[PDB]
Amino acid sequence: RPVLVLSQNTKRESGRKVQSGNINAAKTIADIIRTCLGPKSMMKMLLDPMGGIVMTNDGNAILREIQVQHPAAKSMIEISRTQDEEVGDGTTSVIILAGEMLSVAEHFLEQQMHPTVVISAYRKALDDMISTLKKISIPVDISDSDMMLNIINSSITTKAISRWSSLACNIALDAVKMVQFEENGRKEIDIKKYARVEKIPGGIIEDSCVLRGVMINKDVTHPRMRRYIKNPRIVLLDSSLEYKKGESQTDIEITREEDFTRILQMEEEYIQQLCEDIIQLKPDVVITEKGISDLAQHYLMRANITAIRRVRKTDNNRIARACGARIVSRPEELREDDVGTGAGLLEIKKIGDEYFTFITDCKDPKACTILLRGASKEILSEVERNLQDAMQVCRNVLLDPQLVPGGGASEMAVAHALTEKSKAMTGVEQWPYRAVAQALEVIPRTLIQNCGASTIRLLTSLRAKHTQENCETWGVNGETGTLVDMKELGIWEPLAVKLQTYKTAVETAVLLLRIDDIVSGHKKKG
Amino acid sequence: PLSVFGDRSTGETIRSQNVMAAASIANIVKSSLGPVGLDKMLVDDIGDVTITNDGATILKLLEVEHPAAKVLCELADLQDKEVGDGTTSVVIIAAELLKNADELVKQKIHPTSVISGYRLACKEAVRYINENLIVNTDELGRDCLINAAKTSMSSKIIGINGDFFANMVVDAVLAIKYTDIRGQPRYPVNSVNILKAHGRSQMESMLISGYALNCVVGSQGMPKRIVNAKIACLDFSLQKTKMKLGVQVVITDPEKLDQIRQRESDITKERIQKILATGANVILTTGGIDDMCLKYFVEAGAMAVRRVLKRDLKRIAKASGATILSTLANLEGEETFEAAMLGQAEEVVQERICDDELILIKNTKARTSASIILRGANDFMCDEMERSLHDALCVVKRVLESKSVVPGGGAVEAALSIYLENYATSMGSREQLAIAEFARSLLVIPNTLAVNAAQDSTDLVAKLRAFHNEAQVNPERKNLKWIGLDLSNGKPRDNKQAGVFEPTIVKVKSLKFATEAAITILRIDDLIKLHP
Amino acid sequence: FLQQYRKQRMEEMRQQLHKGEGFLDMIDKEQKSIVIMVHIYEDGIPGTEAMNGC
Amino acid sequence: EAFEAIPRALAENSGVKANEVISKLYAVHQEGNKNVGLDIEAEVPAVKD
Ligand SMILES: Nc1ncnc2c1ncn2[C@@H]1O[C@H](COP(=O)(O)OP(=O)(O)O)[C@@H](O)[C@H]1O
Ligand SMILES: Nc1ncnc2c1ncn2[C@@H]1O[C@H](COP(=O)(O)OP(=O)(O)O)[C@@H](O)[C@H]1O
Numbered sequence A: 001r002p003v004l005v006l007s008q009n010t011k012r013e014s015g016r017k018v019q020s021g022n023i024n025a026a027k028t029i030a031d032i033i034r035t036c037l038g039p040k041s042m043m044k045m046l047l048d049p050m051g052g053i054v055m056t057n058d059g060n061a062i063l064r065e066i067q068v069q070h071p072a073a074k075s076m077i078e079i080s081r082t083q084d085e086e087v088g089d090g091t092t093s094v095i096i097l098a099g100e101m102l103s104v105a106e107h108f109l110e111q112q113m114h115p116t117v118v119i120s121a122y123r124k125a126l127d128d129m130i131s132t133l134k135k136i137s138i139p140v141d142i143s144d145s146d147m148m149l150n151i152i153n154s155s156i157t158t159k160a161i162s163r164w165s166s167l168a169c170n171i172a173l174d175a176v177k178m179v180q181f182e183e184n185g186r187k188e189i190d191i192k193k194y195a196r197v198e199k200i201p202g203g204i205i206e207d208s209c210v211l212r213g214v215m216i217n218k219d220v221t222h223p224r225m226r227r228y229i230k231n232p233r234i235v236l237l238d239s240s241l242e243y244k245k246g247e248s249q250t251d252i253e254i255t256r257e258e259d260f261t262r263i264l265q266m267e268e269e270y271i272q273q274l275c276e277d278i279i280q281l282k283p284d285v286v287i288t289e290k291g292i293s294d295l296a297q298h299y300l301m302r303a304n305i306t307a308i309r310r311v312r313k314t315d316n317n318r319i320a321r322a323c324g325a326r327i328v329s330r331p332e333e334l335r336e337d338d339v340g341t342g343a344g345l346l347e348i349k350k351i352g353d354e355y356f357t358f359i360t361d362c363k364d365p366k367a368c369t370i371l372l373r374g375a376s377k378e379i380l381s382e383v384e385r386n387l388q389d390a391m392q393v394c395r396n397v398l399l400d401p402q403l404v405p406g407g408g409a410s411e412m413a414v415a416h417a418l419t420e421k422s423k424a425m426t427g428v429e430q431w432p433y434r435a436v437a438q439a440l441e442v443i444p445r446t447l448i449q450n451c452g453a454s455t456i457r458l459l460t461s462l463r464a465k466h467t468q469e470n471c472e473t474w475g476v477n478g479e480t481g482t483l484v485d486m487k488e489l490g491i492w493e494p495l496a497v498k499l500q501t502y503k504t505a506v507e508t509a510v511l512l513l514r515i516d517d518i519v520s521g522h523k524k525k526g
Numbered sequence B: 001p002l003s004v005f006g007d008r009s010t011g012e013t014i015r016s017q018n019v020m021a022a023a024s025i026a027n028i029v030k031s032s033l034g035p036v037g038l039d040k041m042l043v044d045d046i047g048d049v050t051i052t053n054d055g056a057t058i059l060k061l062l063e064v065e066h067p068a069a070k071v072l073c074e075l076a077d078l079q080d081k082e083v084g085d086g087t088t089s090v091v092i093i094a095a096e097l098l099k100n101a102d103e104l105v106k107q108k109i110h111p112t113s114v115i116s117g118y119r120l121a122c123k124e125a126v127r128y129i130n131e132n133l134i135v136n137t138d139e140l141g142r143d144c145l146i147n148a149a150k151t152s153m154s155s156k157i158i159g160i161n162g163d164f165f166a167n168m169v170v171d172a173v174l175a176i177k178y179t180d181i182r183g184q185p186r187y188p189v190n191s192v193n194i195l196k197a198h199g200r201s202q203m204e205s206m207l208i209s210g211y212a213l214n215c216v217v218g219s220q221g222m223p224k225r226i227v228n229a230k231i232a233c234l235d236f237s238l239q240k241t242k243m244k245l246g247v248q249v250v251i252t253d254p255e256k257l258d259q260i261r262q263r264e265s266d267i268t269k270e271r272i273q274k275i276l277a278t279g280a281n282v283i284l285t286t287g288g289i290d291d292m293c294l295k296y297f298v299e300a301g302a303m304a305v306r307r308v309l310k311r312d313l314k315r316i317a318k319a320s321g322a323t324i325l326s327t328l329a330n331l332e333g334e335e336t337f338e339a340a341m342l343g344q345a346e347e348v349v350q351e352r353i354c355d356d357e358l359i360l361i362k363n364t365k366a367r368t369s370a371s372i373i374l375r376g377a378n379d380f381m382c383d384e385m386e387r388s389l390h391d392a393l394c395v396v397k398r399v400l401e402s403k404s405v406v407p408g409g410g411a412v413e414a415a416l417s418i419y420l421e422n423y424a425t426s427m428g429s430r431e432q433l434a435i436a437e438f439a440r441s442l443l444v445i446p447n448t449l450a451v452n453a454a455q456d457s458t459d460l461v462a463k464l465r466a467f468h469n470e471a472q473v474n475p476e477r478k479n480l481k482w483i484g485l486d487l488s489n490g491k492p493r494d495n496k497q498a499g500v501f502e503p504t505i506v507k508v509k510s511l512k513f514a515t516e517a518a519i520t521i522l523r524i525d526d527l528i529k530l531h532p
Numbered sequence C: 001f002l003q004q005y006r007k008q009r010m011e012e013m014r015q016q017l018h019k020g021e022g023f024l025d026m027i028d029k030e031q032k033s034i035v036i037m038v039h040i041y042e043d044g045i046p047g048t049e050a051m052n053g054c
Numbered sequence D: 001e002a003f004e005a006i007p008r009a010l011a012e013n014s015g016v017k018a019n020e021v022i023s024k025l026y027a028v029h030q031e032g033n034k035n036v037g038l039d040i041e042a043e044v045p046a047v048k049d
């Protein structure tokens, strides 16, 4: 006779234990990737459940590959994913910052301070953090290619692609610049859709380049078609070039001898009419997202036209952007404006043991492909991740032209500013304010720890330097472990990335500080 | 001797069991009351996580076995539906009422007398609230709405963010205002589309001066921004025409097959041309659009969005002045589309929100609508912000509909307790005890508020009761009715002066629902549990 | 060459774009219009992990 | 600083704010009174010789 109020499997936990467990879980999640921050970071091998291997040092990827049971850890993983999606950089930094703020919050929670006071202090501190970050920022002339390349390099010095810095920086800058678009008064970049990254294992990494056009893993439908066209006129389609059934039930009733042959002849005639309608525009290349019939191939070759079939819709959109064409579903409605002129060369060449189609000489293309050659699949995947980081940073700089000193200089400057501001609070919440201000020192501390120098002496020297008047740009050299000026070293980062990191860390601390009860095990009740 | 296949509990056993279940349900959510309350993080045993403070959400997510506890859970659900705020308070009040009533019953007081006393106390408490503890919002203005929103959003993840969120909520509520027949200003909440997206901080939440759609254009060839939009709302799919079940195509002369197949799509082509001939720029449909009509819209340089939600389409049509068209058929038997069916907006843009895109319909003419885009750190925080925002919107709607508000921070509870303790002596001999216990049970709210702040609950409630007793006894010190609890410093404070307000309907409905729940549970003295 | 399943590689690369009484009770309830694929396994014997990941 | 755990524990068990007691104790001991500590016979943070 198990009479109960709640279900048997329902488990309830509350009190100081819940707060301690949440804070410890966040701390340990931070400790997982603490060592993967800075130019001297180490790789990590992740064994995917589906048998794959993910070798990387990006915080978001490492945290995403990990499965956890504690809900606070899930919250931290979601925080990392949000940081990656919003700006594309600073995942490790935001995770470490959230862990440090939760640590300094636990310190107060051990005493008799209510979490609401800590949360209010954190919000005030975050406002002051945003104000100081906006204050210490500097403008950037986007038209200066050298400045953009330096920004991208500073973004990619901490990744495995840093060995080839100029090449990766040029690839990312060219892709972002040529994917930029402006229509109807609306400006967009759209790195996600266009600027595709295509990786082909083999070759050498120095052979990687961004093409002035697109490249797909497709071959001509019939071998008699030309594999090299000088100035092709490309026409894009979605509808199949073959006889398909109608939408309604359309049973025929044949009672005469010649009706069957007439029906087959009219099928052939319909194919011929479609091909003639396509040919009327006098194109050189026809691309379709669906199949092209063999009779259609013959009728197109009769007009000296190269045909490619079964292309993905995203690839077709990329081709349309690159070569300045418009996708058309009905050949009878093909206009001259729909014909794609602007591609400067189309070429089908074999790489390894597989044919690839190149449209790689377009003038003013609004889409591109990044052809990566590398040692293997995992190395190319890491290179693609680094290129994504570089392109995201470039887009952030283009949209928002302010910069912020790196190497922990911004962290120390903001910490000093908040510490100075806290001197006039004269309240009970000044202690959490100062604690969360000083929690920003975890970034230079982590940089020094990863570098291998003495943490305490270097942090003391950096704080003493930052107590001076013009020292907001003084940070930590990640390689030599020495105090340098980032207006000399040149490590600068977008203001948007730092703002997003700080906001996300503070709000994660606020969200996790709010919970004091856990109930679990209940049915979904969907 | 009964030979009933089951278990039977009778007398004090079942009453104590019901009180235990109600008290357990109350204790589940008692720690999430008031600004010093803290949230709970629920796990759905499949990895799903829900962080929330709302009582209704907590009680719905939990699975409950005892039926007397199910009564309180569905009571919280009813309070959420009919009011939108005070969901934990009603549960706590009902449980305390049940506990004190069970104490009376165990003292050999018949349950009928307790129920009669509870009914009398509830009626007199409602009367006293309506006659002594109401403040008209006419002489306060927008500050009253702002303060009510701030009070509602306290104890929520947008607490300190209240200075901004209250303005946002008030503007959103006032945007959707309309007057029906009899000249009654009715505020239709749930028409404010709440869109969430993780990313920037909560300060970056945007209130749209128009409507926000969680959908994108169907084809990349279409423009992503139209300045002078002419919205055409449709309720039919734009695909290839297919005959119904009762129509079948049978071909005997082979020459007609091509014409049949061509007309199958020419019908839809003609419909699209008729729609576009009136100058339409944005086309919204609840159904799907195939690639052919998408290309038609691409060539015309016009928007085309498919699979639009029905409620979103209705709101867009009402705001922009467009008319929903489930079909193209006039009263002349023809198939035509006229410009009078077109809605208008000052701009339609597909904006990017944290690597994802959504459509913004800005500044609809002939009617003003609103939508809120909530920016957070992750999905859970966005969900909690949405729930708290809905609570604030409901509170603002109640305040704008009925122009009476009551002081917050347990002032109403203390005043009611004092008045009912004084009043019980004038009615009956045992219903006197029932009304006294009702008055004592009403004190649970300030006690819980003080306890959640780690303050001396006994001393604070004693001081509050002394202030309210002085207010009720002395007729020249009636300004102490507004003295409530200031949980920041743990001192009594004039909450009306401090701007802590709640709608009167919240208190009235909570009291009525709690009284009915307590009466319903108290009527049971025997339980038969049949074996399944 | 259709036997080699030329679309297998593209399907694989798009798949990675992630973007006692219980046995009776979870099938006795809920809608009959959805498909449930129950999995049977025992720890220690190889071959379960591959299909679990699949 | 580890010695502060004793007066802090005494204040926590007594039911008052430990930080106020510790601050008052430091103030008094800075004044020059070495024989002043927590007074548990009070509802508010207080000290006495
Ligand atoms: N050359 C450098 N010298 C010193 N610090 C650097 C250098 N390059 C980058 N950093 C620091 O390393 C941090 C970037 O670490 P990174 O591995 O990119 O983490 P995330 O991927 O989370 O951004 C930045 O805070 C920056 O200040
Ligand atoms: N700023 C404030 N100061 C004092 N009391 C408040 C304040 N804001 C809200 N309260 C009180 O806290 C109580 C708890 O409300 P809450 O639990 O948030 O509503 P619900 O029961 O719908 O969740 C309310 O009865 C209200 O009177």
Ligand SMILES: [Mg+2]
Pocket: A089, A090, A155, A158, A389
């Ligand atoms: Mg980085």
Ligand SMILES: [Mg+2]
Pocket: B085, B086, B087, B152, B391
């Ligand atoms: Mg409320």
